[PDB]
């Protein structure tokens, strides 16, 4: 039996709304550690790593390590039905091929029960070693979404280069060229100016904006997004989940 009670149900809703546009089906792994997920898109160009640590759940019950294969869109359609104020509970009896989503109001005057069928999924899991990236860029999530959306209206590829002069985002297309340079302010005196740019060694890589724009679906999860880059590795775009975990997007470069 599996019973995970999460007080802030809006998180799970925002988490599923994120991953669903990049991945159709994936396994949710439940362990003593927590609720996790790892999957690549159909092309194997991008990868998504999700973690909702056990500490975040007001109640975490997991007798044995298990995996639940799921149609992310379907689970998302179901979670869309819970009120942002609702207390969501994931229940699963290892002996059945169904998972149960309970949605309870704070007052308990409304209790919803959403049963869904699981599915056998044989997904490929990659071993991702930790590494100190050459350049780390922290900026307002809304601004990152802005840059990707804007630049994609101009071209399809974005060259993200980090030097001593800041981080440049450039693209070219049929109508012309466009680049956007962000630099740290004298001080971080407001959210907008919360741009931190760590740069141990200069980096410059090119990526498909279509994928970057898919990662931005996670925007509502946090006000900040962290971008990690190394000259010989896929970029990392991370959004913290509240304070109990995260969603990490990996995107192979164009070389």
């Amino acid at each position: 039996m599996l019973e995970l009670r999460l007080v802030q149900g809006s998180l799970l809703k925002k988490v599923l709304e994120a991953v669903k546009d990049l991945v159709n089906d994936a396994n949710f792994d439940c362990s003593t550690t927590g609720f996790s997920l790892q999957a690549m898109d159909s092309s194997h160009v991008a990868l998504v790593s999700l973690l909702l640590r056990s500490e975040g759940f007001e109640h975490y019950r997991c007798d044995r390590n298990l995996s639940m294969g799921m149609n992310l869109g379907n689970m998302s359609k179901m979670l869309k039905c819970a009120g942002n104020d609702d207390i969501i509970t994931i229940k699963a009896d290892d002996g059945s091929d169904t998972v149960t989503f309970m949605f309870e109001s704070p007052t308990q005057d409304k209790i919803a029960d959403f049963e869904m069928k699981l599915m056998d999924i044989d997904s490929e899991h990659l071993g991702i070693p930790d590494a100190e990236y050459h350049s780390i860029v922290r900026m307002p999530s809304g601004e990152f979404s802005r840059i990707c959306k804007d630049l994609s209206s101009i071209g399809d590829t974005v060259v993200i280069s980090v030097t001593k002069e800041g981080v440049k985002f450039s693209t070219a297309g049929d109508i012309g060229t466009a680049n956007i340079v962000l630099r740290q302010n004298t001080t971080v005196d407001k959210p907008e100016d919360a741009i931190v740019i760590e740069m141990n060694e200069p980096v410059s890589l090119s990526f498909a904006l279509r994928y970057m724009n898919s990662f931005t679906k996670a925007t509502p999860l946090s006000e900040t997004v962290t971008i990690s880059l190394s000259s010989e590795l896929p970029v990392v775009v991370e959004y913290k989940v509240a304070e109990m975990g995260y969603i990490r997007y990996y995107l192979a470069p164009k070389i």
Binding site: H44, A46, E124, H125, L126, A252, K254, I255
Partner: peptide, 11 residues
């Protein structure tokens, strides 16, 4: 040319 995640990490 677009590379793949598998070009850097493995199962």
């Amino acid at each position: 040319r677009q590379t793949s995640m598998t070009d850097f990490y493995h199962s």
